[PDB]
Design a protein around this ligand. Structure first.
Ligand SMILES: Nc1nc2c(ncn2[C@@H]2O[C@H](COP(=O)(O)O[C@H]3[C@@H](O)[C@H](n4cnc5c(=O)[nH]c(N)nc54)O[C@@H]3COP(=O)(O)OP(=O)(O)OP(=O)(O)O)[C@@H](O)[C@H]2O)c(=O)[nH]1
Ligand SMILES: O=P([O-])(O)O
Length: 1095
DNA sequence: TCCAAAAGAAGCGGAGCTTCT
């Protein structure tokens, strides 16, 4: 252990003594880090990192010599070198700001003088950077090596951080803001998704800094310093970037939104470089110069990504061997640029792509304020995708003379729910714009005869891309629907694209031509279809047409169907047989396809089935209050308002209700996964208000074109036949808004009662500022909840089955109870350790625990089985990083601001997370994993979780393999996996040890409401063990069901489009039987199997 | 209670209580 000597030799002049027991100032940098056995950073040992790296960046020859490589990325040319020269000079400016900020900190309140006199200011939350200073006469100065290396990290972060951030949705913004998700003001989500929170910015910066410093953390040093020092440095660099205007800080006052929200929340936005900045073409020169093993880079040719050892953001969970094999397979796939699409995008240009695929130029006064904010977010996503694609294209273009010949590989990792995620925001898996420009799919096709199988494959790809629902009709019928479209409405766009694929020119009205031809079929993949068909038309050799056009083998109501197959536990029922067939499990129908099912047997998918059940439940609710005119009227008004604005709700002239599957799509999915009804009500209301705000811009558009337009024709002219007819749609609108905001349903003793809000809407509508908000939004939500969402939930349960609902409830309860215990025991062992440390004279409050101490606490929980194992996947439901364990500031900047909480990897309560973790994981996650690793695994695909893009040459075999992979996943038993973990947990848990908080948390899950109050430890223990029994019985039923199903003749077409179903070749023939007959025979086999078990 | 990543700021003082034009 000559590690102390080693690091002291590199940093001999840092203030203090590297001995935790020494009496004076102790140096916590040298106490916290060691030199690595093998070099990680080329700046370790450098007297002047900025000068050294700037010299390295100054020429190709110098770069190659610094990095010890033969050749540099060809994108690193003269123009890029000139930009890095200028960036390096800016690095000097950042360094200078930092030095001045230190000087100010040392001067203020005599901190420097006191520090020199022995005040341990280096251990304060704002003084941890004093661990990297050196005595300088009557003052102190930064160690230049550590300062300059940190600045290099700062520069790289500045270049590429924005592109690397997570996407914020409504739930994220709700957690951040503390505002109820259903009540988030319009445009707030966009505001927060465009910026980084303090924790987001500092943590990403701190990671980079620690990486570039290139040392290893001492396992026996307190986290207050190992995490604290790089975090303190990050905070200072963020502050310096704010001074330099590289970063804008915006402190958002929540009280202007919710007046009793006291939170003021910092948002940090990096100043964007010009889209045409040469540095965009190679933004990682610093990273690839400093680090021996760079993270940030593109992988060209045979440069392939390494395989990740651990689950994304879950370092306690190693990727299994099967998972690692899947990752290797996906990373091995070669992606290539499709030049025609790149040229098309380029020729249209950014402005016209925004006009076509976004919202175009916004006239902020033909626009409702709320609608305007939604349109800004639409533009932002498309624009960022476009810019990112072209930066990537510029880098590819440097690699060779023919950009279409340059292989590209992408890094992937497994997420906590077992999905293979392509790393990055703007890649083929995540970004539709990019997905049509960079593809692994490729085929050489004989399209000389429109009767070829090759031409049929080509047609299928075109049709699917053009929004023909290819899984709902046979290949033959598809062909005719496509032909009708190509020769009809799409013809003008095809002609335009033929001209483009001849001369390279587009007409001035290109956007209008595409818009009018496509209508609601418009998408990036639709643009690919127009491109590829027109290319075929002009092709000189149609017998060898080369195209990346693909067919997606795409899951049919995938999550719900997987849940039903994986977690239904009872005897077989005929309703279940009928409903599961809607997802492509066919019993007694050899070689049956989804296409045939939809066309000849049942045109109603699982969404339509639940929508139909909603119509029944709604009808019953209307009957239970038949005599109640106020209630009937309130329901009518809700339905009227929805009919006005949503395509999926239609009221006929005689009051006949038609609901389309579209309204049940998200509600169905999220309900199984443990979503409450209130959140669904919120989302349905948001869909309505979105449409209202959109219609208000339609009004402003009408008025400007025609000053003497009536308010009725302005708002309902596109929807009506006469002027007075538009007047009745307007009368409906104002009547509906008044009654739905001034009156709400409340459930009192099971019966719905109407209550006045006192906060009804009325007054002249100002279409520009019109906003539904606060108490008015709450009211619309309460109406939606009781008169629509509740019936829908009843319909959903009827459709997926009460048995599945029971399984998911037991799953939720078991995993929640386990997570509560894990969280509480981890916290107690931490608190017990802190009580010991307080007796240690070397320890100070704010120093936390060491990594060794934390690992020992993590290891101590292992007899509680925190991990779920399936044999090929590992799930850690409780795994989190949170600020609650340490409950303290980690570091601040030198102005006593940017106070970053100390976050710790620790178990936290699951809530309902167990349901989606296991359903997604053992369903689509296992499917894809299997597809990547099975015998004859399809090559050259793009997997997107529950769909896989396949090149036209291999659509048949790849689809059949996909259906086989579904079948393989259907041999899983997630409840059994949960049971095995929970049973071990039950063997080792002591409920008497839990805090009354944890004990209450468990009570809610394990006990009926009337029993929470004050039940005993032994009560909740006995209730928790009953859940173990429930799990065991469910797991047993599932096992039997899968075994029995596998004995029978099955045709599986869940990954549908192509009509290539997987046959299980089970030997019991259930053909020419009704579902009732089939249920009887399956239940006979079940009881047979149950008897073999008992005997 | 849907999931795939968390996540107030800042004066005084040197942690953690306090207050929030
Ligand atoms: N908890 C949960 N799960 C959700 C969900 N929406 C969907 N899921 C899960 O995915 C399957 C299949 O859904 P699908 O729409 O066919 O395919 C999606 C999906 O796999 C994934 N995805 C989008 N949003 C979410 C999400 O909010 N959560 C999760 N876990 N997954 C999501 O991405 C696929 C779409 O990829 P693509 O870029 O091609 O986009 P599309 O062309 O489909 O159009 P777009 O609007 O962008 O999606 C479900 O059965 C379920 O298990 C949800 O809200 N919550
Ligand atoms: O066109 P699809 O949605 O049936 O694959």
């Amino acid at each position: 252990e000559e590690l102390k000597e080693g690091i002291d030799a590199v940093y001999p002049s840092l203030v203090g003594t590297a001995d935790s027991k020494a009496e004076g100032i102790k140096n916590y940098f040298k106490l916290s880090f060691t030199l690595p056995e093998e070099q990680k950073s080329r700046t370790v040992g450098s007297e002047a990192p900025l000068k050294d790296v700037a010299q390295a960046l100054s020429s190709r020859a110098r770069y190659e010599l610094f990095t010890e490589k033969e050749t540099a990325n060809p994108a690193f040319n003269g123009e890029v070198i000139k930009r890095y020269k200028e960036l390096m000079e800016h690095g000097e400016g950042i360094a200078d700001i930092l030095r001045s900020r230190l000087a100010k900190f040392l001067n203020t309140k005599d901190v420097g003088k006191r520090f020199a006199q022995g005040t341990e200011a280096n251990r304060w939350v704002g003084g941890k950077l004093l661990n990297i200073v050196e005595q300088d006469g009557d003052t102190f100065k930064y160690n230049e090596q550590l300062l300059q290396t940190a600045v290099l990290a700062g520069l790289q972060w500045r270049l590429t951080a924005t592109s690397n951030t997570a996407i914020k949705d409504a739930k994220d913004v709700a957690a951040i803001t503390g505002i109820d998700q259903a009540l988030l003001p319009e445009g707030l989500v966009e505001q927060f998704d465009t910026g980084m929170t303090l924790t987001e910015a500092v943590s990403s910066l701190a990671q980079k800094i620690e990486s570039y410093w290139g040392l290893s953390r001492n396992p026996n040093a307190p986290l207050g310093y190992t995490k604290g020092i790089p975090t303190a440095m990050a905070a200072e660099i963020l502050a310096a970037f704010v001074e330099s205007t590289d970063v804008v800080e915006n402190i958002v006052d929540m009280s202007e939104i919710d007046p009793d929200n006291k939170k003021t929340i910092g948002l940090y936005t990096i100043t964007e470089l010009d889209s045409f900045d040469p540095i965009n073409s190679f933004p990682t020169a610093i990273e690839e110069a400093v680090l021996v093993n760079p993270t940030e880079k593109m992988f060209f040719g045979d440069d392939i990504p390494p395989v990740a050892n651990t689950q994304l953001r879950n370092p306690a969970v190693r990727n299994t061997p099967e998972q690692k094999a899947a990752l290797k397979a996906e990373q091995a796939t070669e992606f290539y640029v499709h030049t025609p699409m790149v040229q098309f995008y380029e020729t249209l240009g950014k402005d016209r792509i925004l006009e076509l695929m976004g919202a175009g130029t916004l006239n902020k006064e033909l626009l409702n304020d709320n609608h305007a904010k939604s349109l800004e977010g639409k533009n932002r996503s498309v624009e960022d995708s476009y810019n990112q694609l072209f930066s990537v294209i510029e880098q590819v273009r440097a690699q060779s003379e023919d950009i279409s010949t340059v292989p590209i590989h992408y890094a992937y990792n497994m997420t906590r729910v077992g999905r293979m995620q392509m790393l990055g925001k703007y890649n083929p898996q995540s970004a539709k714009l990019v997905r049509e420009a960079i593809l692994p799919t490729k085929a050489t096709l004989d399209l000389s005869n429109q009767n070829n199988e090759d031409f049929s494959a080509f047609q299928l790809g075109l049709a699917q891309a053009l929004d023909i629902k290819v899984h709902t009709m046979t290949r033959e019928v598809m062909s005719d629907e496509l032909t009708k479209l190509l020769e009809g409405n799409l013809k003008p766009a095809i002609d335009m694209m033929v001209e483009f694929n001849t001369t390279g020119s587009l007409p001035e009205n290109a956007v209008d031509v595409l818009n009018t031809a496509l209508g609601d079929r418009k998408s990036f993949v639709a643009l690919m279809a127009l491109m590829e068909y027109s290319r075929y038309l002009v092709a000189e050799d149609k017998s060898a047409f080369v195209t990346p056009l693909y067919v997606e083998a795409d899951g049919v109501t995938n999550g719900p169907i997987n849940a039903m197959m994986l977690m239904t536990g009872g005897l077989f029922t005929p309703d279940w047989i009928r409903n599961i067939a809607k997802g492509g499990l066919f019993i007694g129908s050899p070689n049956k396809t989804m296409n045939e099912h939809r066309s000849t047997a049942d045109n109603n998918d699982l969404y339509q089935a639940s929508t139909n059940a909603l119509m029944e439940s709604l009808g019953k609710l209307r009957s239970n209050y038949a005599s109640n005119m106020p209630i009937q009227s309130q329901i009518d008004s809700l339905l009227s308002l929805m009919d006005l604005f949503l395509p999926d709700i239609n009221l006929g002239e005689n009051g006949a209700l038609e609901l389309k599957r579209g309204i049940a799509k998200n509600p169905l999915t999220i309900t199984i996964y443990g979503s409450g009804a209130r959140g669904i009500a919120g989302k349905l209301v948001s869909s309505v208000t979105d449409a209202i705000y959109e219609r208000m811009s339609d009004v402003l558009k009408a008025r400007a074109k025609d000053p003497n337009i009536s308010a009725a024709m302005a708002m309902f002219g596109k929807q009506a036949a006469s002027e007075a007819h538009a007047e009745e749609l307007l009368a409906r609108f104002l009547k509906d808004m008044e009654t739905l905001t001034s009156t709400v349903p409340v459930k009192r003793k099971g019966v719905l009662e109407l209550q006045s809000t006192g906060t009804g809407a009325k007054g002249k509508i100002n279409p520009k500022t019109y906003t539904i908000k606060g108490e008015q939004l709450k009211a619309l939500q309460e109406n939606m909840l009781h008169f629509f969402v509740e019936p829908l939930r009843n319909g959903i349960t009827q459709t997926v089955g009460e048995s599945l609902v029971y399984s998911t409830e037991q799953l939720q309860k078991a995993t929640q109870i386990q997570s509560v215990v894990l969280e509480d025991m981890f916290k107690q062992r931490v608190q017990e350790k802190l009580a010991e440390k307080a007796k240690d004279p070397t320890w100070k409050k704010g120093d936390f625990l060491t990594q060794k101490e934390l690992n020992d606490i993590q290891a101590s929980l292992n007899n509680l089985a925190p991990m779920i194992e399936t044999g090929s996947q590992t799930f850690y439901i409780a795994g989190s990083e949170n600020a609650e364990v340490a409950n303290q500031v980690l570091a601040t900047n030198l102005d006593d601001r940017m106070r970053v909480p100390m976050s710790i990897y620790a178990p936290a309560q699951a809530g309902v997370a167990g349901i989606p973790f296991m359903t997604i994981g053992t369903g689509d996650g296992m499917m894809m994993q299997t597809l990547s690793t099975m015998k004859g695994a399809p090559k050259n695909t793009l997997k997107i979780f529950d769909g896989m893009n396949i090149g036209l040459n291999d659509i048949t075999d790849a689809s059949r393999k996909a259906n086989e992979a579904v079948y393989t996943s259907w041999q899983g038993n997630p409840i059994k996996n949960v049971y095995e973990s929970y049973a071990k947990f039950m063997k080792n848990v002591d409920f008497s040890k839990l805090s009354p908080e944890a004990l209450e948390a468990i009570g809610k899950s394990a006990l009926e409401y009337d029993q929470r109050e004050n039940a005993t430890v032994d009560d909740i223990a006995n209730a928790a063990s009953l859940i173990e029994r429930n799990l065991r019985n469910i797991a047993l039923g599932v096992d039997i069901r899968h075994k029995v199903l596998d004995k029978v003749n099955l045709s599986i077409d869940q990954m549908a489009a192509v009509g290539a179903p997987y046959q299980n070749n089970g030997k019991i023939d259930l053909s020419n039987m009704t579902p009732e007959q089939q249920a009887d025979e399956l239940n006979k086999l079940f009881r047979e199997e149950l008897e073999a078990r008992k005997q």
